[PDB]
Curated annotation (Swiss-Prot), chains A, D, E, F:
GO terms for biological process: defense response to virus. One of its GO terms (molecular function) is toxin activity. It comes from Saccharolobus solfataricus (strain ATCC 35092 / DSM 1617 / JCM 11322 / P2) (Sulfolobus solfataricus). Probably oligomeric upon overexpression; does not interact with a Cas5 (Sso1441)/Cas7 (Sso1442)/crRNA complex. Forms dimer and tetramer-sized oligomers when overexpressed in the absence of CRISPR loci A-D; the oligomers are probably responsible for its toxicity in the absence of CRISPR loci A-D. Part of the aCascade ribonucleoprotein complex, minimally composed of Cas7 (formerly Csa2) and Cas5a, which binds crRNA. Other possible components of aCascade in strain P1 are Cas6b (SSO1437) and Csa5 (SSO1443), while SSO1399, Cas5b (SSO1400) and SSO1401 have sometimes been seen weakly associated. Transmembrane segments: none annotated. CRISPR (clustered regularly interspaced short palindromic repeat) is an adaptive immune system that provides protection against mobile genetic elements (viruses, transposable elements and conjugative plasmids). CRISPR clusters contain spacers, sequences complementary to antecedent mobile elements, and target invading nucleic acids. CRISPR clusters are transcribed and processed into CRISPR RNA (crRNA). This is CRISPR type I-A cluster 2/Apern-associated protein Csa5-2. The aCascade complex was purified from strain P1. The gene is csa5. InterPro entries: CRISPR-assoc_Cas5.
Swiss-Prot record, chains B, C:
It comes from Saccharolobus solfataricus (strain ATCC 35092 / DSM 1617 / JCM 11322 / P2). This is CRISPR-associated aCascade subunit Cas7/Csa2 2. Crystallography and cloning were done with strain P2, while interaction experiments were done with genes cloned from strain P2 but over-expressed in P1. The aCascade complex was purified from strain P1. Part of the aCascade ribonucleoprotein complex, minimally composed of Csa2 and Cas5a, which binds crRNA. Other possible components of aCascade in strain P1 are Cas6b (SSO1437) and Csa5 (SSO1443), while SSO1399, Cas5b (SSO1400) and SSO1401 have sometimes been seen weakly associated. Csa2 is probably the major RNA-binding subunit. The Csa2-Cas5a-crRNA complex also binds target DNA homologous to crRNA, probably forming an R-loop. Purified aCascade forms a filament about 6 nm in width. The keyword ATP-binding does not apply. Keywords: Antiviral defense, RNA-binding. CRISPR (clustered regularly interspaced short palindromic repeat) is an adaptive immune system that provides protection against mobile genetic elements (viruses, transposable elements and conjugative plasmids). CRISPR clusters contain spacers, sequences complementary to antecedent mobile elements, and target invading nucleic acids. CRISPR clusters are transcribed and processed into CRISPR RNA (crRNA). The keyword RNA-binding applies.
Length: 126, 316, 316, 126, 126, 126
RNA sequence: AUUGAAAGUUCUGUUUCGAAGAAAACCCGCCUCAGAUUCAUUAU
């Protein structure tokens, strides 16, 4: 269940990165040394995702069926496979961070891997 | 000997740099082991290397020596401290290389009568007859205080753009804020004294004549380090520094003050100084304390106000 | 005998070096076997050799002996502890080589009345009639505590550049941070006593006269080791050291305190000392404890505050 | 009990956000650096909820049974699962803020998570 | 599958080394004694690869067909044969490192072998 | 194929020895009792060879045609006849070492024989 | 139940003594997130 939480946080970070086209929040998350830095990124990335939801540029979908998130940014279309974190996942993840900030680095490494694979595939198709 | 412990508070700081990735300039970071109520933990914290402090101290010493008429080397006149390591430096300065071991002392004296920097900060020559001289000033890395369970330090990245009327210009800079602490040691009893063992060589009389001036210049050079004139990127990222606590000890025997990690590190070091003087059969032990945070000090301790008074007292 | 166990906390450290690869200076590392809840594992951890500690102790002993008027050897006057191993050292000092086995004792006495370092730290002469003398001070490698499942140690590399106005200057330095522990033993009942079996030889009266001063100097020399004056690269990489726990035992019978690997190693060693005194028919057993981390100690144990008090108590 | 107070707080902020269709109060709460900013948001969000109660657009309910709050806004229907804070929860939360303003960031992060999940589900339906 | 994961991690390290012209990350990886050092290198090398992807200096290709990665650095062209690691490969590799840090040394030795062979071939053709 | 792998590892050790003028890595390799010691030497020797490649003091060539490696050290010129190991040879050799550390002793004995013959010939010509 | 049958080559020993990979070194020199936007029209 800890790995599932970390994977859902990584999906949120990857969606926020692909939508904003900025690595800055993922960099801040993976370099965090305090619960303050982690919590600030968790807010700021969800605030970016909230704007994408309100613009209908971020939407949940299913793809062949697996749960996925479609992201439209600057005329590029990306699809992240998996769920976004729940409020309980954020709370349980913050408790994991209060024990060991290592889990922020693990989620950041996964998020960057998701984003890199999607960006590579999108450039190859173009 | 003169041994000191200093605490500084710096905000919005970037004086030391490391290799860059992409368009990001990174700040030096190091691992630290810290003790909490739950045990021991490992953290990554920004730090500042001591080589920058040594370079600033040597530059200030060069300036003071040039102002006071003391000799300064040709290459060291420009702020390039290669000293006398390679043969090109020897050729530029015009000093013959040592022939055998017995001549090494002579070579050392020839190096020692031309540049005060080689005398104070030491030097190395590698070859058939290697010559070594350890530095008379010792510094260390600048680490924030490891007090309590939370490290009072933070690091972040900042976004910057360059304007242009014809886009075809974006970079990031790392900025840190912390409460730094560092210690230093300087033995003035060996300044202007040859270190290589051997026989007497003509030219030591001039060194004996200039010993007092060299010691005075070396003591004066610490003002730059104690004031805050060190580090790079000062043109657009000038830091805000403020002294908080300073302890200086003058002894005739080896001694090391406690690191500035705990809130009570002045009373402990004063008691340790007294007991060390008692046990080691010393004859001189003086302490000076500058306090601006209202922490415990002790009794029978001289209290100063600024750093210039400390420098004057050390000189006198 | 005097047996001690000491725990230190060191951060941003590089005092011991090994062979270098390219432009990288490496820190000594050793394998350790550690027990976890899943069994036993093998790890690679930075360590510090005991030879540096021995060199620092011998240098401090040389300084103390020179200050107190005790004889010091010509080669040992300079900090080069070749002692009397080769024939060149004997020729420089001016001591005739032993002729047969029966003369060996005489040679030992001649070595023992000229240098206190040979008496305390032992020596070796190889030849037709070899002469051996085991050191009276025993040290070991400095290993971090193997407590729990995670080793509280870390090692990394740091980047450094040398400035030059005409590029044609880049190196890396290894830096470690850990919580070190080490133990030491010193038997003062055999200082200034010949070890080679034989008949009485003129000159033992002087040794008997100087025995008290030699023992006092040997006890005093431990202050440098207990304070933190050892290792190299102190000019630019001065470490931050802080004592955490110390146990010292004085006995008339052989004894070894528990290593500082577990959090509870003072109560155990005190109980073992009491039972060993009971079982081995001893007549003297004293313990001193310095604690700064708030761990369990026990009952009926003398508690000190600094190291100078311990040194004074040991001398008295 | 601290987590229960923070959760009930989140729920109040999420109800106020869904009813007002404005993130401004949650943004102010999560960026608060003083007890003044936190207390001002706690009043302003409760004043918005009070208007929704008086209009019968905010009502307590049970849903399959879990306690919930129904919110009607601009013809959208939302349901937040959980209780609203009591007067004692507000007083105890203000005491927690006087010790550490971190708890306002925690409540803000939870509130935005609740609101985002509800908005995503509402957009998907239909 | 463990050897395939190690081989894909070695390809990532070799691509990062050839693109950055710096052995520092491979040196750190092969000398790692903790999961912290390994994870830090896995982030930093992927961050270097991400910059090369965004600049179109790192691209996936096929070569006669085998999967490959083209790397352009300082006017030199290199081709690494094989796949880059997936997010699952990074996660499974980190689990292997949590059991035995030996696998970081194995991946580092393979990465340096790939880079050395490519650098030798490029110098010979020049 | 096992003998060819051992011979290519011996060529790598001989090149590293002739370039560094140090037997220490070959001594460590031939005295290895664990996979750790063997793998550490395989890295360190390749790191020495990498510096010689970057300095253009180690280069692949053909000599009358047989494949060879030219080594320039301290104004001495040496030529080792044969190929250097591939990444696959290192991996297959490490698998042979995991079965029997004897193969490290065999490669060390061959490497010292290559180096001794070359050093003897170079001293005779001088 | 055999060129088989019947038997200890077993006892006593340290590879021990000693020696710092040490000295010298800056990642520092230049850059702006910039220009444009009404919460007002109806309510004793």
């Amino acid at each position: 269940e800890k790995e599932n939480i970390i994977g859902r946080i990584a999906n949120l970070l990857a969606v926020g990165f692909l939508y904003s086209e900025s690595p800055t929040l993922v960099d801040r998350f993976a370099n965090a040394l305090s619960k303050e830095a982690v919590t600030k990124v968790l807010y700021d990335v969800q605030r970016i995702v909230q704007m994408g939801i309100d613009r209908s540029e971020i939407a949940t979908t299913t793809i062949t069926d697996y749960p996925a998130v479609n992201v439209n940014s600057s005329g590029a279309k990306y699809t992240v496979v998996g769920y976004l974190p729940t409020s309980q996942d954020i709370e349980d993840f913050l408790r994991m961070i209060e024990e060991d900030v290592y889990y922020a680095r693990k989620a950041g490494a996964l998020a960057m891997s998701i984003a890199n694979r999607i960006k590579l595939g999108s450039k190859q198709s173009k | 000997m003169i041994s000191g412990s200093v605490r500084f508070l710096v905000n919005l700081e970037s004086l030391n740099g490391v290799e860059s990735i992409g368009n990001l300039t990174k700040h030096r970071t190091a691992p630290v082991v810290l003790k909490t109520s739950t045990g021991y933990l490992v953290r990554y914290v920004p730090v500042i290397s001591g080589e920058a402090l040594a370079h600033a101290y040597q530059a200030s010493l060069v300036d003071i020596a040039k102002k006071e008429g003391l000799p300064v080397g040709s290459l060291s006149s420009q702020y390039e401290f290669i000293k006398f390591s390679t043969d090109e430096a020897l050729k530029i300065e015009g000093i013959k290389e040592p022939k055998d071991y017995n001549d090494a002392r002579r070579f050392e004296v020839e190096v020692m009568l031309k540049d005060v920097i080689a005398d104070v900060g030491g030097f190395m020559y590698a070859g058939g007859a290697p010559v070594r001289r350890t530095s008379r000033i010792k510094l260390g890395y600048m680490i924030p205080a490891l007090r309590g369970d939370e490290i009072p330090a933070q690091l972040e990245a900042q976004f910057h753009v360059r304007f242009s009327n014809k886009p075809v210009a974006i970079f990031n800079v790392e900025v840190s804020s912390a409460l730094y602490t560092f210690s230093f040691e300087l033995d003035e009893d060996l300044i202007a004294v040859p270190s290589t063992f051997g026989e007497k060589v003509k030219g030591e009389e001039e060194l004996e004549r200039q010993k007092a001036k060299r010691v005075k210049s070396a003591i004066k050079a610490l003002y730059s380090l104690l004031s805050g004139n060190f580090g790079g990127k000062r043109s657009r990222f000038l830091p805000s520094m403020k002294l908080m606590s300073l302890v200086v000890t003058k002894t005739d025997f080896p001694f090391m003050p406690e690191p500035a990690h705990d809130d009570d590190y002045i009373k402990t070091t004063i008691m340790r100084l007294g007991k060390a003087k008692g046990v080691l059969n010393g004859n001189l032990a003086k302490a000076y304390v500058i306090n601006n945070e209202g922490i415990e000090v002790g009794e029978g301790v001289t209290v100063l106000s600024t750093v210039e008074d400390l420098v004057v007292k050390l000189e006198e």
